[PDB]
RNA sequence: GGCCGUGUGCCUUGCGCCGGGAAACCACGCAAGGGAUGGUGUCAAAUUCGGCGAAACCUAAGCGCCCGCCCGGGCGUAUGGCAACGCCGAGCCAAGCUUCGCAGCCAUUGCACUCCGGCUGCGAUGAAGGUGUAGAGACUAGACGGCACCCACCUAAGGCAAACGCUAUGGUGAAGGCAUAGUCCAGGGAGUGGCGA
RNA sequence: AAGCCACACAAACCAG
RNA sequence: ACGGCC
């Protein structure tokens, strides 16, 4: 459902078949209609498949992304989003 | 395809030698002999272009010595040659393993910030090994070759044991394939001419 | 010399 | 393999 505020958003239940370099371009464009986007982490590993992290510049870009994009059908799959359960290395090198 | 010799590769035994080993044992120098060298299964492809090295054996231009002197011969010798065979640079290669692509199935609903789940199908790469290396060479197999497993034997690092100790992912069971077993086709047996001394 | 290369080629056989 | 000899 929901967790506690964070710059990065945890997206799962994605389509596991689409390639790493292809999925990044399907994301960076689709979520920038809220604000500026930083980096996007995707791994194909047994543990990390069907999961993606999207890092924004401010909470405003992430909070609006959480509600307006929750459940949105992505490649015939209901995209589930949560707030990141831990701060990302990219942000923790600034704070 | 018999019996003598020569060389060279091979292993056993003996000595070195301390080089990799934890030990077994490999590796290196050499001397002498030929009594011993496990099993099943699996792969047949690449088979190209160059280059260095070679003994016994074959022969004697030059050279030295001699037949006193030239002509002639003779004696020794390879720097000429044949060649068992030892290899190097680039390429290339079946199966199996190293690591990445792409497809398919199997799982997986998973919180990460360094990379990563398992198989079967092609694709490329990595380490072996093979080709290059046959009498010029062509085609067939499987073995003595590659790969998997098994057994016999030796050792036991590590892992297991309180412990006498147990256990191999370690080693040993030769080389031959610079054509082995075979079909060819050269080559000699069996000619002619060129080069050479 | 020994051998090497080019044509030409009878048989068993020797033949890597 | 390379010399002999059968
Ligand atoms: Mg014997
Ligand atoms: Mg064949
Ligand atoms: Mg002589
Ligand atoms: Mg003279
Ligand atoms: Mg060659
Ligand atoms: Mg050949
Ligand atoms: Mg061969
Ligand atoms: Mg041979
Ligand atoms: Mg033969
Ligand atoms: Mg030969």
XYZ file of C-alpha atoms (C1' of nucleotides) and ligand atoms in Angstrom:
324
model
C 0.000 0.000 0.000
C 2.051 2.957 1.329
C 5.272 3.627 3.287
C 7.165 6.680 4.627
C 8.436 9.564 2.364
C 11.542 9.199 0.134
C 13.159 10.737 -2.987
C 13.316 7.338 -4.714
C 10.293 5.143 -5.474
C 10.186 1.337 -5.399
C 8.273 -0.058 -8.375
C 7.561 -3.788 -8.710
C 5.161 -6.244 -10.436
C 6.626 -5.107 -13.757
C 6.966 -7.231 -16.889
C 10.066 -9.391 -16.373
C 10.654 -10.030 -20.106
C 11.528 -6.476 -21.286
C 15.277 -5.757 -21.421
C 17.218 -3.567 -18.941
C 18.259 -0.895 -21.456
C 14.743 -0.833 -22.981
C 12.876 -0.543 -19.663
C 14.961 2.491 -18.600
C 13.695 4.489 -21.610
C 10.120 3.361 -20.916
C 10.525 4.913 -17.449
C 12.697 8.055 -17.671
C 10.185 9.511 -20.135
C 6.947 8.341 -18.469
C 7.750 9.681 -14.974
C 9.396 13.001 -15.941
C 5.903 14.450 -16.520
C 5.948 15.196 -12.764
C 9.413 16.748 -12.422
C 13.132 16.222 -13.010
C 14.474 12.647 -12.804
C 17.917 11.475 -11.671
C 19.058 7.839 -12.110
C 17.082 4.610 -12.709
C 18.275 1.245 -11.345
C 17.079 -1.974 -12.994
C 18.496 -5.471 -12.518
C 17.565 -8.717 -14.260
C 18.715 -10.963 -11.389
C 16.425 -13.569 -9.769
C 16.152 -11.261 -6.760
C 15.809 -7.924 -8.601
C 13.761 -8.866 -11.702
C 10.414 -7.117 -12.193
C 11.618 -4.266 -9.980
C 12.878 -0.746 -10.648
C 14.018 2.273 -8.642
C 13.321 5.768 -9.978
C 15.238 8.639 -8.348
C 13.743 12.157 -8.488
C 15.219 15.588 -7.633
C 12.489 16.521 -5.115
C 9.671 14.837 -3.152
C 7.111 16.811 -5.196
C 8.106 14.869 -8.334
C 7.844 11.581 -6.399
C 4.670 12.193 -4.361
C 2.594 13.107 -7.436
C 4.119 10.099 -9.223
C 2.986 7.839 -6.362
C -0.723 8.689 -6.706
C -1.192 9.532 -10.399
C 0.742 6.437 -11.534
C -0.383 3.878 -8.922
C -1.910 0.836 -10.655
C -1.329 2.224 -14.165
C -1.213 -0.803 -16.556
C 2.382 -1.187 -17.742
C 2.873 -3.874 -20.419
C -0.396 -5.581 -19.361
C 0.687 -5.555 -15.697
C -0.649 -3.385 -12.811
C 2.358 -1.275 -11.757
C 2.667 -1.277 -7.940
C 4.595 1.548 -6.254
C 5.904 2.149 -2.725
C 8.250 4.664 -1.106
C 11.844 3.397 -0.836
C 12.447 1.561 2.446
C 15.989 3.002 2.558
C 17.712 6.148 1.238
C 19.533 5.703 -2.076
C 23.336 5.972 -2.363
C 22.961 8.788 -4.923
C 21.136 11.066 -2.459
C 23.112 10.063 0.671
C 26.232 11.452 -1.066
C 24.700 14.946 -0.891
C 22.846 15.066 2.441
C 57.977 -59.439 -41.887
C 62.210 -62.316 -39.569
C 67.514 -61.641 -37.291
C 71.697 -58.323 -36.178
C 73.727 -53.045 -35.243
C 73.251 -47.459 -34.910
C 70.588 -43.011 -33.579
C 66.265 -40.787 -31.166
C 61.753 -40.584 -28.270
C 59.826 -43.968 -23.952
C 59.304 -46.038 -19.270
C 61.489 -49.070 -15.083
C 65.654 -49.301 -11.799
C 70.006 -46.490 -9.812
C 72.297 -41.948 -8.872
C 72.400 -37.015 -8.658
C 69.368 -31.946 -8.146
C 66.693 -29.545 -4.241
C 63.426 -26.299 -8.640
C 56.686 -26.733 -8.242
C 54.238 -29.751 -4.317
C 51.246 -30.072 2.134
C 52.689 -35.436 0.865
C 52.303 -38.705 -2.778
C 54.457 -37.400 -6.701
C 55.810 -34.371 -10.940
C 60.115 -31.617 -13.137
C 65.346 -31.360 -14.428
C 71.050 -33.851 -15.599
C 72.815 -38.515 -16.716
C 74.170 -44.079 -16.691
C 72.257 -48.962 -17.796
C 68.109 -52.473 -19.312
C 63.301 -53.550 -22.121
C 60.170 -58.070 -17.306
C 55.175 -54.545 -16.216
C 51.649 -49.879 -18.641
C 43.351 -51.204 -16.196
C 37.967 -50.695 -17.841
C 33.234 -48.481 -20.143
C 31.033 -44.571 -22.542
C 31.469 -40.057 -25.724
C 33.586 -36.250 -29.841
C 35.374 -36.535 -35.597
C 35.508 -30.998 -36.467
C 39.483 -27.443 -37.793
C 42.408 -29.949 -41.349
C 45.402 -22.554 -43.405
C 49.619 -19.109 -44.158
C 54.594 -18.688 -42.757
C 59.471 -19.692 -39.336
C 63.425 -21.768 -36.282
C 66.050 -26.598 -34.706
C 67.957 -31.556 -35.403
C 71.036 -36.958 -34.499
C 72.486 -41.745 -36.679
C 73.038 -42.508 -41.621
C 74.596 -40.901 -47.148
C 78.256 -38.459 -49.926
C 83.325 -35.736 -50.358
C 83.641 -29.737 -53.658
C 86.937 -27.108 -50.442
C 90.750 -27.992 -47.032
C 94.707 -30.573 -44.487
C 98.106 -35.034 -44.717
C 100.231 -38.473 -48.326
C 101.526 -41.075 -53.150
C 108.732 -36.814 -53.894
C 107.191 -32.866 -58.465
C 102.095 -32.178 -62.776
C 98.560 -35.870 -64.409
C 96.005 -38.904 -61.909
C 94.542 -41.342 -57.647
C 94.382 -42.248 -52.169
C 93.399 -40.882 -46.576
C 90.518 -37.700 -42.960
C 86.686 -34.210 -42.430
C 80.693 -31.823 -43.398
C 80.255 -26.406 -44.165
C 76.457 -30.590 -48.989
C 72.388 -33.788 -48.083
C 68.424 -37.340 -46.476
C 65.793 -37.465 -42.160
C 63.654 -40.188 -37.247
C 61.856 -36.032 -35.046
C 62.083 -31.034 -30.801
C 59.348 -26.632 -31.489
C 57.881 -20.723 -32.390
C 54.234 -16.214 -34.861
C 49.213 -15.525 -37.016
C 44.810 -18.006 -38.168
C 41.189 -21.854 -37.295
C 38.432 -26.030 -34.518
C 34.029 -31.096 -32.525
C 32.276 -32.483 -27.839
C 33.059 -30.879 -22.751
C 33.930 -27.440 -19.287
C 35.340 -20.159 -18.374
C 32.504 -15.775 -19.313
C 29.036 -12.889 -22.071
C 24.439 -12.280 -26.244
C 19.512 -14.115 -28.460
C 15.101 -17.530 -28.118
C 12.215 -21.114 -25.241
C 10.639 -23.700 -20.821
C 11.103 -24.029 -15.317
C 10.687 -21.587 -11.236
C 10.770 -16.219 -8.682
C 5.914 -10.917 -6.232
C 11.481 -10.109 -4.882
C 14.547 -3.253 -1.564
C 18.660 -2.515 -4.476
C 22.463 0.638 -4.898
C 30.087 -3.832 -7.558
C 28.856 -8.141 -10.800
C 25.769 -12.389 -10.902
C 19.165 -18.493 -10.534
C 18.910 -23.382 -13.146
C 18.666 -26.422 -17.692
C 18.198 -27.379 -23.140
C 18.718 -24.469 -28.991
C 22.195 -21.514 -32.144
C 26.183 -16.757 -31.581
C 30.739 -15.010 -29.969
C 34.541 -15.180 -26.603
C 38.392 -17.604 -22.320
C 41.897 -21.776 -20.647
C 43.478 -26.767 -22.280
C 44.315 -29.646 -26.409
C 44.310 -30.219 -31.688
C 45.541 -28.435 -36.625
C 50.475 -26.300 -38.792
C 53.938 -31.609 -38.531
C 52.203 -37.729 -44.061
C 56.201 -40.826 -48.382
C 54.076 -34.309 -51.863
C 48.970 -35.313 -50.785
C 43.093 -37.359 -50.892
C 39.086 -40.022 -48.196
C 37.509 -43.572 -44.104
C 37.366 -44.856 -39.142
C 38.834 -45.029 -33.548
C 43.230 -44.813 -30.295
C 47.826 -44.271 -28.076
C 44.318 -38.442 -29.001
C 40.284 -34.781 -26.573
C 36.078 -35.054 -23.108
C 32.920 -37.742 -19.134
C 32.823 -41.693 -15.709
C 34.566 -46.060 -13.364
C 38.152 -49.416 -10.967
C 43.387 -50.550 -8.877
C 47.171 -48.253 -6.282
C 49.983 -44.160 -3.303
C 49.557 -39.859 -0.304
C 46.018 -36.853 3.040
C 46.225 -30.666 2.527
C 41.636 -29.238 3.495
C 36.802 -31.029 5.297
C 34.881 -34.554 8.938
C 36.400 -37.204 14.498
C 37.168 -36.497 21.537
C 39.985 -40.139 19.250
C 43.289 -45.282 17.003
C 41.710 -42.289 12.194
C 38.223 -41.461 7.771
C 37.893 -39.190 3.016
C 40.447 -36.871 -3.187
C 38.491 -31.383 -5.930
C 45.769 -34.396 -5.593
C 48.816 -38.115 -7.934
C 50.410 -42.924 -10.572
C 48.418 -47.202 -14.634
C 54.957 -45.283 -21.064
C 55.981 -43.124 -25.567
C 54.031 -44.126 -30.700
C 49.336 -40.537 -34.666
C 55.531 -35.340 -38.118
C 49.209 -40.189 -41.093
C 48.253 -45.260 -36.402
C 44.988 -49.127 -38.512
C 42.837 -49.017 -43.779
C 41.219 -47.463 -49.137
C 43.674 -44.341 -52.427
C 47.342 -41.728 -55.020
C 52.768 -40.363 -55.386
C 57.977 -42.995 -54.717
C 61.613 -47.126 -55.412
C 61.438 -51.729 -58.032
C 61.877 -50.140 -63.784
C 63.275 -44.875 -68.188
C 64.501 -39.988 -70.014
C 66.501 -35.230 -69.413
C 67.983 -30.488 -66.010
C 70.939 -28.813 -61.477
C 75.280 -30.774 -58.347
C 81.427 -31.461 -57.451
C 78.935 -37.182 -55.782
C 74.849 -37.962 -52.087
C 70.672 -36.153 -53.376
C 66.855 -32.651 -55.407
C 63.169 -30.725 -58.970
C 60.318 -31.929 -64.687
C 58.156 -35.174 -67.975
C 57.411 -40.287 -69.020
C 56.014 -45.084 -67.210
C 55.593 -53.183 -67.129
C 54.265 -56.751 -62.630
C 54.860 -59.085 -57.737
C 56.851 -56.685 -53.938
C 59.271 -52.683 -50.495
C 56.797 -48.690 -49.007
C 55.295 -42.954 -44.329
C 63.527 -44.223 -38.665
C 68.540 -45.516 -40.323
C 72.736 -49.039 -41.870
C 73.657 -54.774 -42.580
C 72.248 -59.746 -43.777
C 68.180 -63.783 -44.831
Mg 58.496 -54.978 -22.626
Mg 35.743 -37.086 -41.757
Mg 81.688 -41.551 -42.048
Mg 92.371 -33.024 -53.164
Mg 54.796 -25.075 -42.234
Mg 48.039 -32.773 -43.139
Mg 48.459 -35.127 -36.404
Mg 55.862 -42.193 -37.381
Mg 49.931 -46.364 -42.259
Mg 56.784 -40.137 -41.185
